[PDB]
Design a protein around this nucleic acid. Structure first.
Lengths: 208, 181, 128, 114, 194, 48, 55, 181
RNA sequence: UUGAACAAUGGAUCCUACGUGGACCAUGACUGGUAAGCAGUGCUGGUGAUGCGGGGUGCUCCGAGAGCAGACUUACAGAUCCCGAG
RNA sequence: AGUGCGCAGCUCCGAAAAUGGAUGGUGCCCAAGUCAGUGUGUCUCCCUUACAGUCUGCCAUCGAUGUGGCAGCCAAGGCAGAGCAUCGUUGUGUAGAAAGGGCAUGGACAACAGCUGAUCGUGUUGGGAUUGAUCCCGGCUUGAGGCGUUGCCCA
């Protein structure tokens, strides 16, 4: 991991199965409240409507260009991570000092790179697609939309994620064995010193 | 249901006895209104426009808020109403399973608002009645009129207080559990 | 009364802002000294939301502390030993400010006599 | 070393008292950790709170410690609640700085009444 | 099941308190008695906690639900001699404007404050000075030394029968008081009873 | 704000416009008299 | 139904059973102990005991 | 005695026509800008020149026909005995000597002794139960200033019957005064 | 019962220096015109002369009216985030 | 149960303009759309805040009362359109006005036994006072072929 990211500490949010704008808004409010957040797996973020509807929405968005010089015009990113960063930017007051401080606390990433794969990632219940969208309703995928408008790196990240998942499975099995024998150690000590629990009327000044 | 924000009144009124009419007729309305102010309002809105007796020339003898006798047994209330639309008036018969008549009336009002964009002051309750389960003609009522209705809770979202609404929830949820936490 | 104003009541002044003439910061011809705006479209005169303060009487301060200095004392411009002898009985309310033109020879005598009378001279150390 | 012990609750300064387009820099809004309802702010009502920031020069430290430090302190009090989601209105002296927003503030358990 | 009315949570003699601030943060002490309204004499024993005979505001301590049954212990202390005034020349900065309330609520305070004594030259506090920075420093050292030695008398006079009582009561209380109270990430003060 | 009635301004004249100090002395005398004798005649003379 | 949560057990009873019979059914079927022995009961009890625990 | 009459009527199946209200507390809910001339003049005559100012008025033909025409700017209602008492003991000032003086028993004796009224209890009695000297008491009183109510108003613009906060709140003005004191 | 209510620091008698005499906006009260951010009117209120809260922005809408401050509370209207308030 | 007429709510078509663009942006989809209800002196979450309402302090205005030595005594005030004490009311403003109150400039008549070579005035830079017009002072320049404060009058 590069030095500046070795220095990194914060919360890691699994962006998979999340509604894009609700995610963005939760992340934005928390960044303003001063949290550092890294929204990981931005290709697996969900958007609330049909694939074709969102494809046409992105088409009409990218229609907007500065006619005198486009290289100065609205930038329309092909990466899911960068699209998400722009939605979060829009939710933030990025044209102030505290607003740019929040936006620089934002730490969006694609796939799951290393400083964040070494960390416990969470999910926002509000903004979660399963917990929010009715099953009746349709939804799309940000990586699908981004490969539709370009973004040649979907499969490149799919392979890397498969590799990461194999390593994670190895570590998960080792962790299962270690938690087995850690319960073993706990019971071995439960023989020596019985665990005193909160549900006890014995804990008092005439006892103890 | 819970807190039908509606109180039932059985208002009784007449006109001030003039010397030509020393005993004017007496009318008794049944009004489902938020409070007694709105109740008496509706009573006089019917006194005028059905009897030419005006709030200023009339006289309320009783008001009598009515409380539900046994709110622990479910009844099937059929409400006959009429309401005004953008076009003219339409007659409606709807029915609701509820433990209280005021409950069924709040249910009717919110249902009419939902389905037809009707409003309280644009709905006028014609008679209400309680039906034996052999007299309910709607499907969404006849499906619960069985004795041992039974169903699971499948895509549940586990309502929880704001005190412990996890903003980040480092665990993995599951929409199909029993949902104690 | 030969009574100095306390710090308790000096700190209860009412925060007069730093009034300025509007747009005295655009031009060096427009001086800093206040002038009531008489413009027809003036947003300052119309008191728009984020514009500076408008000189008024609400900012005027109580009689007990108005013109009192952070010393707690009012000032009196003296040029003679006569004026010191005038302030003889109010050495706690007033402070003898020597006039700026009074020479060193009379400043010496004023400072001497005023320190015998125990009147504070705000500009005691002026010329030698 | 001596046992370093924690007798405060962290909060975040969530800006000043404000309407949509104007603000009151005298009354700061603070969101306290794990406090997410208005009922839970009755504990912290009245407690003292300090905002810690770092200067460059060394200012005098604790009263009687006679050692200086780069930390600087703005003390205040939690005066009331703010809304329903567990924010409080606190008043500081001097008024909290502008780069205090989005920063941590310690809320001590004194004056205690339990 | 009875909610009951609200009461002023207040320290009692023999109640375990938790100091909220000062040199001893979060240490558990035993409230001995009240000196002034809202100020209490405490000590988490200097052998158990290391907290000496000390005073505390009712506002910088948590009143836990742990009562020690301090019955039958000699708690008599010369509070004025032990804790000096530290503000010499008690109430003279300006010539007394008169105390011109004549019977009640000024006289009943002035007489009640003319009753108590004064920590004399040894048990009082020493205001600072230079005397070549040392002729004061050394004498202050031995003054402090003898004052501490005079306080140790009463402190042990309380703490020798007070430890013999808490060990007599149940032996884990000494480690209960040796342990310091801290907040961790999952502790919410607005929900913690005491 | 308040839909005000007219704030009271006393119509009557209560300061001598005369520049003669002795007319002012007479105004002083008859202020004293209209106060601490309070007869209609004294009030009239004060007015005049 | 958003406010309730379903426990693993069930009784054999008709609609609107009076207290006279419902209390004897819950007693005979031992629903309180069969509930207190569950996992959710113990999670909730540890939570509530942490809550009401003294210093 | 009124309760006994109601008891007897309910016992024997009669109608107790409740005595029509005599006093009403009137509160100015609307502001002062954009005021039509006749409502402006009638609010002046009612002494409701400030927003959230209240006055007691007698309810008869003359006063009601004014209350109607200025209703979009006022609420009014029939206050309870304890609401009258709280108003008098916490908000009442004398309109005397062209000043606004805090009510005292000596000031009441001076301004109203002519009518055998000596104490604040006399004022409260006449106000609640009009009595002969309601006019003199109410004139002696200065229009109550009340704070902006806690909770707040539903909507200034509608009528109380329309969910808003105007017109006649026959008994729900106690709920409003309680918020405004 | 001093013979309707409510209000009322008010009624009478005068003198006198000015600015203004381009208006405009809103509403089944309308007239001309197909209509107009058109032209001409009526009642009342506003703008002009008026800031403040909201309507993103806006001379006229909705609230409310403006000495300097402190505390509390609200109006209109609001609470995904921007942006205080679920 | 099936088949007809219809009637309301939302949705779809009807629905086309020229820089790229606008429910304000983001976005939202059991909504963050829409229709209702509910937040009760009571509510696990009905809360936010205008220069508006309430209370308080101060400023100013317009008044009321007692006075403005014939006073219980000191302290204060002590110029009768002044001052003193208490209370009450009211504070937007273009044109316009004030027999409302002040700041400031040149000079005459007067007062300050005013200041000035132990350094005037000017200017410059800091400080203090003032709601403000503006006033006072320290430093430096500078050095007089001087200046200022109060009343009043002529501009």
């Amino acid at each position: 991991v590069k030095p500046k990211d070795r220095k990194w500490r914060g919360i890691v949010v699994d962006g998979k199965n999340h509604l894009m704008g609700r995610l963005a808004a939760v992340v934005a409010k928390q960044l303003l409240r001063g949290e550092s957040i890294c929204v990981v797996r931005c290709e697996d973020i969900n958007i609330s409507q049909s694939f074709m509807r969102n494809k046409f929405r992105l088409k009409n968005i990218m229609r907007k260009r500065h006619l005198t010089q486009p290289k100065r015009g609205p930038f329309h990113y092909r990466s899911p991570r960068k699209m998400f960063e722009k939605v979060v930017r829009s939710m933030l007051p990025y044209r102030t000092a505290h607003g740019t401080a929040a936006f620089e606390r934002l730490r969006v990433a694609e796939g799951i790179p290393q400083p964040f794969a070494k960390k416990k990632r969470c999910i926002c219940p509000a903004a979660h697609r399963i917990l929010r969208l009715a099953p009746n309703r349709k939804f799309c995928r940000l990586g699908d939309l981004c490969t539709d408008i370009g973004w040649r790196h979907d499969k490149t990240i799919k392979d890397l994620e498969g590799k990461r998942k194999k390593l994670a499975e190895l570590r998960w099995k080792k962790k299962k064995e270690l938690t087995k024998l850690r319960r073993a150690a706990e019971r071995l000590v439960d023989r020596i010193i019985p665990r005193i629990e909160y549900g006890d009327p014995k804990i008092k000044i005439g006892s103890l | 249901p819970g807190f039908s924000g509606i109180r039932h009144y059985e208002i009784v009124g007449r006109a001030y006895p003039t010397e030509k009419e020393p005993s004017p007729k007496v009318y008794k309305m049944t009004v489902f209104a938020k409070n007694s102010v709105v109740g008496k309002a509706r009573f006089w809105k019917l006194m005028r426009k059905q009897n030419k007796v005006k709030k200023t020339h009339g006289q309320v003898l009783q008001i009598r808020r009515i409380f539900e006798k046994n709110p622990n047994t479910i009844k099937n209330y059929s409400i006959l109403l009429r309401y005004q639309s953008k076009t003219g008036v339409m007659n409606v018969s709807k029915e609701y399973r509820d433990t209280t008549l005021c409950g069924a009336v709040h249910q009717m009002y919110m249902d009419m608002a939902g389905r037809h964009h009707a409003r309280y002051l644009d709905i006028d309750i014609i008679g209400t009645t309680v039906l034996k389960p052999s007299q309910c003609l709607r499907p969404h009522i006849r499906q619960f009129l069985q004795h041992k209705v039974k169903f699971p809770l499948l895509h549940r979202i586990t309502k929880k207080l704001p005190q412990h609404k996890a903003t980040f929830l480092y665990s993995k949820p599951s929409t199909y559990r029993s949902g104690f936490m | 009364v030969n009574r100095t104003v306390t710090r308790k009541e000096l700190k209860k002044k009412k925060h007069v802002p730093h009034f300025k003439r509007y747009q005295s910061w655009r031009h060096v011809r427009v001086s800093e000294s206040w002038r009531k705006p008489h413009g027809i479209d003036s947003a300052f005169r119309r008191r728009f939301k984020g514009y500076p303060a408008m000189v008024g009487i609400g900012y005027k301060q109580p009689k007990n502390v108005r013109h009192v200095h952070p010393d707690g004392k009012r000032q009196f411009l003296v040029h003679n030993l006569k004026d010191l002898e005038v302030l003889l009985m109010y050495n706690k309310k007033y402070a003898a400010v020597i006039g700026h033109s009074v020479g060193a020879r009379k400043r010496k005598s004023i400072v001497t006599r005023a320190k015998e009378l125990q009147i504070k001279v705000t500009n005691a150390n002026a010329r030698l | 070393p001596k046992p370093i012990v924690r007798l405060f609750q962290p909060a975040v300064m969530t800006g000043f008292k404000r309407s949509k387009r104007k603000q009151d820099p005298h009354v700061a809004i603070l969101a306290i950790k794990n406090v997410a309802t208005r009922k839970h702010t009755d504990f912290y009502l009245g407690k003292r709170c300090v905002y810690l920031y770092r200067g460059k020069k060394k200012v005098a430290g604790r009263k009687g410690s006679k050692v200086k430090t780069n930390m600087r302190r703005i003390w205040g009090r939690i005066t009331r609640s703010h809304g329903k989601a567990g924010c409080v209105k606190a008043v500081f002296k001097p008024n909290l700085p502008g780069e205090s927003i989005g920063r941590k503030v310690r809320i001590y358990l004194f004056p205690s009444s339990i | 099941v009875r909610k009951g009315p609200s009461k002023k949570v207040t320290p009692t003699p023999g109640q375990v308190l938790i100091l909220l601030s000062g040199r001893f943060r979060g240490r558990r002490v035993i409230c001995l008695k009240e000196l002034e309204h809202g100020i209490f004499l405490v000590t988490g024993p200097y052998k158990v906690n290391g907290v000496p005979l000390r005073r505390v505001n009712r506002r910088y301590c948590i009143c836990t639900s742990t009562h020690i049954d301090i019955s039958g212990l000699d708690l008599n202390i010369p509070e004025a001699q032990i804790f000096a005034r530290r503000k010499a020349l008690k109430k003279v900065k300006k010539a007394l404007k008169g105390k011109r309330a004549r019977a009640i609520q000024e006289k009943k305070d002035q007489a009640e404050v003319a009753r108590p004594e004064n920590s004399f030259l040894k048990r009082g506090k020493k205001t600072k000075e230079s005397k070549s920075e040392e002729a004061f420093f050394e004498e202050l050292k031995e003054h402090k030394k003898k004052k501490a030695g005079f306080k140790q008398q009463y402190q042990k006079q309380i703490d020798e029968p007070l430890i013999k009582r808490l060990k007599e009561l149940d032996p884990l209380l000494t480690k209960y008081l040796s342990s310091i109270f801290t907040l961790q990430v999952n502790d919410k003060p607005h929900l913690m009873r005491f | 704000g308040i839909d005000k009635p007219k704030q009271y301004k006393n119509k009557d004249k209560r300061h001598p416009t005369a520049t003669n100090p002795y007319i002012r002395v007479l105004v002083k005398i008859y202020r004293f008299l209209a106060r601490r004798v309070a007869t209609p005649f004294n009030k009239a003379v004060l007015k005049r | 139904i958003k406010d309730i949560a379903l426990t693993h057990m069930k009784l054999k009873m008709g609609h609107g059973l009076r207290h006279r019979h419902l209390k004897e059914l819950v007693a005979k079927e031992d629903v309180l102990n069969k509930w207190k022995k569950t996992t959710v009961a113990r999670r909730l009890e540890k939570q509530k005991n942490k809550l009401n625990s003294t210093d | 005695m009124l309760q006994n009459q109601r008891r007897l009527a309910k016992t024997f199946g009669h109608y107790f026509v409740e005595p029509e209200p005599k006093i009403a507390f009137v509160i100015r809910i609307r502001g002062i800008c954009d005021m039509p001339p006749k409502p402006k003049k009638i609010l002046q005559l009612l002494r409701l020149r400030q927003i959230f100012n209240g006055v007691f008025v007698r309810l008869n033909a003359a006063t009601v026909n004014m209350l109607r025409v200025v209703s979009p700017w006022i609420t009014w209602g029939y206050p309870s005995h304890q609401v009258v008492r709280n108003l008098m003991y916490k908000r009442a000032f004398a309109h005397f000597a062209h000043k606004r003086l805090p009510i005292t028993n000596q000031l009441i004796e001076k301004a109203l002794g002519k009518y055998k009224i000596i104490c604040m209890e006399d004022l409260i009695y006449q106000l609640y139960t009009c009595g002969p000297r309601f006019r003199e008491v109410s004139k002696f009183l200065w229009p109550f200033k009340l704070s902006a109510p806690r909770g707040g108003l539903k909507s200034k613009k509608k009528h109380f019957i329309e969910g808003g906060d105007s017109g006649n709140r026959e008994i729900y003005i106690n709920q409003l005064i309680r918020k405004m004191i």
